[model samples]
Structure formats: C-alpha cells, structure tokens
Target: KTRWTREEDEKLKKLVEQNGTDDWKVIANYLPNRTDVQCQHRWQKVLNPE
Candidate 1:
C-alpha cells in the first residue's frame, strides 16, 4: 500500500535531476506524504540502479 504514483515518480525524477539527491528536503517537498528517507531510498533503488 506504500507504492509510489506516476506523478510522484516524475516529480522526484525532475527534482533529483535539478537538485541532486542530497537535497532530500527539497525533493520531499514536491512529493506529499513522502519522507526524505523514502525519497532517497526510492531514487537510489529506481533511478540509480546498478
């Protein structure tokens, strides 16, 4: 039940691309109901996958 929405993913991608991962607070602001840690972890797992 904690799955991310398409809008959330898109916004996170834009924010991360513009601001980078270090600005978790700023990124989290764009995504309501999501925590900074969640943002960081999600981006690391989905966006920066190896």
Candidate 2:
C-alpha cells in the first residue's frame, strides 16, 4: 500500500535504534505486510531524506 500506517513508522524507528538502515531486508521479515524496499525507501526518503 502506498499509504503507510503511523505505528509502522513508530515501530520502524524502534528497529532503526537496534539495526540501522542496511538491515532493512531483515527488518521486512518483522514487517511482513510491507517489504524491505518499502522500509528502506520510507526510512531514507521520509525519515532522513538527502
């Protein structure tokens, strides 16, 4: 889904604390409704855009 849930963002932020960005593929396993690319793009392009 293009629209992401708010708590997903919250949970993602928590994972970032323990895992950082590169492990988003692993993180996606934890967020099965979503995907690794979704996590990566969301974190990079939304949370910390260049």
Clashing pairs in 1: none
Write model 2 residue lDDT over 1-50, tens digit each, in one string: 56878788878778877887767788787776888888877877556656
The 0-to-1 C-alpha lDDT of every candidate, in the order given, reads: 0.84, 0.77
Once superposed on the true structure, which residue ranges of model 2 sit more than 4 Å away at CA? 48-50
Question: Which 10 consecutive positions of candidate 2 have the poorest summed lDDT?
Answer: 41-50
* TM-score of predicted structure 2: 0.73
Q: Over the stretch 28-49, how does candidate 1's per-residue lDDT look in tens digits?
A: 9888889899898888877665
Give residue 11's lDDT in candidate 2 (0 to 100).
81
Per-residue lDDT for 1 in model 2? Answer: 53
TM-score of 1: 0.79
